[PDB]
Design a binder for this molecule. Structure first.
Ligand SMILES: [Mg+2]
Ligand SMILES: [Mg+2]
Ligand SMILES: [Mg+2]
Ligand SMILES: [Mg+2]
Ligand SMILES: [Mg+2]
Ligand SMILES: [Mg+2]
Ligand SMILES: [Mg+2]
Ligand SMILES: [Mg+2]
Ligand SMILES: [Mg+2]
Ligand SMILES: [Mg+2]
Ligand SMILES: [Mg+2]
Ligand SMILES: [Mg+2]
Ligand SMILES: [Mg+2]
Ligand SMILES: [Mg+2]
Ligand SMILES: [Mg+2]
Ligand SMILES: [Mg+2]
Ligand SMILES: [Mg+2]
Ligand SMILES: [Mg+2]
Ligand SMILES: [Mg+2]
Ligand SMILES: [Mg+2]
Ligand SMILES: [Mg+2]
Ligand SMILES: [Mg+2]
Ligand SMILES: [Mg+2]
Ligand SMILES: [Mg+2]
Ligand SMILES: [Mg+2]
Ligand SMILES: [Mg+2]
Ligand SMILES: [Mg+2]
Ligand SMILES: [Mg+2]
Ligand SMILES: [Mg+2]
Ligand SMILES: [Mg+2]
Ligand SMILES: [Mg+2]
Ligand SMILES: [Mg+2]
Ligand SMILES: [Mg+2]
Ligand SMILES: [Mg+2]
Ligand SMILES: [Mg+2]
Ligand SMILES: [Mg+2]
Lengths: 144, 64, 117, 201
RNA sequence: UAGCGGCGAGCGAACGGGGAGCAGCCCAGAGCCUGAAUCAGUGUGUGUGUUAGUGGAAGCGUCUGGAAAGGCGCGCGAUACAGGGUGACAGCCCCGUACACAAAAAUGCACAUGCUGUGAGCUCGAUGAGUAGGGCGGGACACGUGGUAUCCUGUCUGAAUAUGGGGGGACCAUCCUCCAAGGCUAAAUACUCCUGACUGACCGAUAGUGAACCAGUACCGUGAGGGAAAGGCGAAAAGAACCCCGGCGAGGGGAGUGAAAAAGAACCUGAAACCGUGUACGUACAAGCAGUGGGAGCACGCUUAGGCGUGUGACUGCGUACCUUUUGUAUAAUGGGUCAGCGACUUAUAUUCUGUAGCAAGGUUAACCGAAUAGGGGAGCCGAAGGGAAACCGAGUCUUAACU
RNA sequence: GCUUGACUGCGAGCGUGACGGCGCGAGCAGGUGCGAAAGCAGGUCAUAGUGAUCCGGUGGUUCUGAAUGGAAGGGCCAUC
């Protein structure tokens, strides 16, 4: 082990392409650009979504929906997150403190995702049909 | 700098569970009396973006 | 990391100009002209390694013909006669014998004449 | 895992994950390359055609003279012209994931042990900040090109090692990946081994 | 991201969170006690910084060489082996460097303290009107008049008075929150004409400044303005005394100096294009991209012959340059007089994919702190859940009254 | 002659398109007309008779509603 006996892993330092450096290289002259037109030019090319002038897809199609401001303050909790809180009591404050939900979250739902192995008390949170069965099976309690 | 979303595209496409995009069908805005109820019924549910168009939508939506 | 091309450039031109020795005027003096000369020289040399094989056989045939005719038979009938006689001596050797061993070549003609009789 | 002490003839109980793990060359290489890149200053520039001194006047008319068309006297095609892709100062430092850094240190230490380049001692100090005293201690210990890692910073030892090119002195906190490789032997104090073990979990 | 937007191209927040830094005051006035906190101007004193400086370790022999720092042998200093110079590469020759010190005088910053001016504390008051608001036209807000709150105001108007007024994004009620139409305020932030110290996977004379050099010069232009070229003898000038040809030339030949003049001032090295002198071979009956394949002869080497190296090339088969652009170019299409040097896919930040590495249902920290490539910092961000426009439901969900 | 199937929700499976789309479709649920019944009817023998998106209008609506209750505005469905 020396400063002149260290090598990178095979395939980890692939050499970059160097356009316009002769015939032998395979990338000489046009540099993989082909012949003439807009795309061959320096700074040449069309913008994202441009289709030649035909009404583009993101314009042919209509807009839909609205953004719900409530969805942004609503989070989901996995059963695998209940054991991660300090205290055995799962509230909005406990999940925030355990870094499970965002500081600005005002509503949360416990869902059947992962497993609950310890008895836990869930408070002031919505619980799904399946997650209620899982929490109660593990010796837990669900209160408003 | 950060890539900028094509804001018009963000109002028309939504990324689904497996990576594709859902959109609203064209032709259900006006000139509706002449259109058959069957035709207008099939234009009501959302549809998926086609293979040929994915590249275009994905280019417009780098943060989807 | 500024790189000066001089040493590499000089070696490249020198390599080409050395291959250009004996060529006329600019062809042995001026890089641009010398470079085109050396490529053409290689192009003809590639072509003529194939052509050499053609020119030598054409010469062997012509000599065998002359020597076959001196012994009263044409090249075509002589080659046929040797083929029927199961003689496998080639055109390079036959043309050599035609020049350096006129007695052995006459013996080959008799062997060819016998197989056509 | 046990490390034999040179002259004390004792043994130190060390983590087999820190001093007995297999060498990951790829991992070590990435961290040593990143370290040498982190030592880079990146201070330089050249002038683009925009930054070369002179005016925006077209050297000669577009048509009629028989000369190739010119636009700028600062053209990168031209002698005295700007540099096409002119350098700007740049930051060559790379991110090294915390775990990748520690894993590389573990791998280096384990190779030093494996190649019998790691020497453990109870104490390593000098009486006064005198280069001659350390030179004599190294001669007696049969050491020449060596890295001395102490538990806590020893000022006399640091001063005595300064004019010795083949010698460096570090506290356990100040260790680096290049230094651990750059010297023939590495002398570690019992307290330094204890401190490095706590660092590398 | 939310939004704004011929809802195009684009433009682009805030709330909240993590950090650097943190500091609060006065007037709208009178009385009581009075120069009581602070601030500025400025005399003095001390600390300390700047503007000159002082000391600063330790090597000699031998070899080569013109010369020793190089090789070899044996010593020695090092809190000094940063760096530079010295006849080749020096820790110990010289200047330095580590470290330790120094100011008659002027000045910066702190505190201490003198003086002039300013006012502290307490009680009772007072509480910014052509203003807020409005109509019209504009402008500013990420927000383009939109359903458009908020801010400024050119024009026309115009309140309430803490039982009062503003804001919470049209607007109303309720509630919460703040108090406009007076003023001051350090830090964290931005920058470099200049001064000092240091540093560079920056350049090294067509580069790096336009300028390594008497360069913003010479030169051009009425002027604003534009704007070059141009570095290297040698260690030391020891820069060639003296003689000769020549016009008391230019230039040269000797002599001498020097290690070298295969350093002579047009001076290190001294490429290429281009131009000569000499020799070998070919060439004055011979038609074309000038080569290539065959090949005699001549010259010159070999080998102790061996039908072989090297140079040349009579004669002979084949054979219309290169680039570019084109369906297609010997093309009578384009480009290049030749040489040398330079001259074109980069860089930053996002984003995705492949390779590779770490860790893995987790992965990783940003600013910043720092013990400074460590460690701290998990604010965040991506992922382990989706469906639906959404409310919402959730391994499902949406669709529909309900789905075979 | 009687009538409103020129139905509402869907749709196995196909056709034709670079795409946006366009077309054919038995069968399922609800409700309906005609026929004694088997049945037939989701317009017209079939293939032309058309205009994406944005912006805006009207009606409906277990959606949203920037402190909160409303409202404005937005969404969704129908349509211009
Ligand atoms: Mg690259
Ligand atoms: Mg081209
Ligand atoms: Mg073309
Ligand atoms: Mg093209
Ligand atoms: Mg968090
Ligand atoms: Mg509609
Ligand atoms: Mg030559
Ligand atoms: Mg040819
Ligand atoms: Mg330049
Ligand atoms: Mg870190
Ligand atoms: Mg911006
Ligand atoms: Mg904050
Ligand atoms: Mg603080
Ligand atoms: Mg000294
Ligand atoms: Mg020399
Ligand atoms: Mg007030
Ligand atoms: Mg106001
Ligand atoms: Mg509207
Ligand atoms: Mg409100
Ligand atoms: Mg005020
Ligand atoms: Mg400076
Ligand atoms: Mg220059
Ligand atoms: Mg030069
Ligand atoms: Mg003279
Ligand atoms: Mg001499
Ligand atoms: Mg001489
Ligand atoms: Mg010279
Ligand atoms: Mg002749
Ligand atoms: Mg001729
Ligand atoms: Mg011919
Ligand atoms: Mg043509
Ligand atoms: Mg042709
Ligand atoms: Mg031509
Ligand atoms: Mg030309
Ligand atoms: Mg009936
Ligand atoms: Mg509300």
């Amino acid at each position: 082990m020396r400063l002149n006996t260290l090598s990178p892993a095979e395939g980890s330092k692939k050499a970059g392409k160097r356009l316009g450096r002769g015939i032998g290289s395979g990338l000489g002259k046009t540099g993989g650009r082909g012949h003439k037109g807009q795309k061959s030019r320096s700074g040449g090319g069309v913008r994202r979504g441009f289709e030649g002038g035909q009404m583009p897809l993101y314009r042919r199609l209509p807009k839909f929906g609205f953004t719900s401001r409530k969805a942004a303050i609503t989070a989901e909790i996995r059963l695998s997150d209940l054991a991660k809180v300090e205290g055995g009591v799962v509230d909005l404050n406990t999940l925030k403190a355990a870094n499970i939900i965002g500081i600005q979250i005002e509503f949360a739902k416990v869902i059947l995702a992962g497993e609950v192995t310890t008895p836990v008390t869930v408070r002031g949170l919505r619980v799904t049909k399946g997650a209620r069965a899982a929490i109660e099976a593990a010796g837990g309690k669900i209160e408003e | 700098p950060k890539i900028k979303t094509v804001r018009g595209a963000a109002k028309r496409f939504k990324k689904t569970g497996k990576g594709g995009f859902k959109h609203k069908h064209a032709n259900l805005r006006h000139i509706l009396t002449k259109k058959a109820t069957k035709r207008k019924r099939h234009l009501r549910p959302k549809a998926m973006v086609s293979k040929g168009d994915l590249g275009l939508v994905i280019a417009c939506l780098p943060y989807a | 990391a500024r790189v000066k091309r001089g040493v590499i450039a000089r070696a490249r031109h020198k390599k080409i100009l050395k291959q250009a020795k004996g060529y006329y005027g600019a062809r042995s003096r001026v890089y641009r002209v010398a470079f085109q000369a050396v490529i053409k020289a290689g192009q003809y040399a590639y072509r003529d390694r194939r052509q050499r094989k053609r020119q030598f056989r054409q010469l062997w045939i012509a000599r065998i013909n002359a020597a076959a005719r001196q012994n009263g038979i044409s090249y075509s009938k002589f080659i046929n006669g040797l083929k029927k006689a199961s003689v496998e001596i080639d055109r390079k050797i036959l043309a050599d014998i035609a020049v350096f061993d006129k007695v052995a070549f006459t013996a080959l003609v008799e062997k060819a004449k016998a197989a056509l009789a | 895992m046990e490390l034999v002490l040179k002259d004390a003839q004792s043994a130190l109980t060390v983590s087999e994950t820190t001093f007995g793990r297999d060498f990951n060359e790829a991992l070590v290489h990435q961290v040593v390359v990143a370290y040498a890149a982190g030592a880079r200053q990146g201070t330089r520039a050249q002038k683009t055609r925009a930054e070369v001194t002179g005016s925006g006047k077209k050297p000669w008319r577009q048509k009629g003279t028989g000369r190739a068309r010119s636009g700028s006297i600062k053209s990168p095609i031209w002698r005295s012209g700007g540099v096409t892709f002119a350098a700007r100062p740049q930051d060559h430092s790379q991110k090294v994931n915390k775990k990748m850094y520690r894993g590389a240190l573990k791998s280096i230490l384990s190779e030093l042990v494996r190649q019998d380049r790691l020497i453990v001692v109870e104490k390593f100090s000098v009486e006064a900040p005198k280069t001659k005293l350390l030179a004599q201690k190294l001669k007696d210990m049969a050491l020449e090109d060596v890295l001395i890692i102490t538990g806590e910073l020893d000022e006399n030892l640091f001063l005595a090692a300064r004019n010795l090119h083949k010698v460096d002195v570090r506290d356990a906190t100040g260790i680096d990946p290049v230094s651990l490789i750059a010297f023939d032997k590495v002398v570690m104090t019992a307290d330094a081994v204890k401190q490095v073990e706590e660092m590398l979990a």
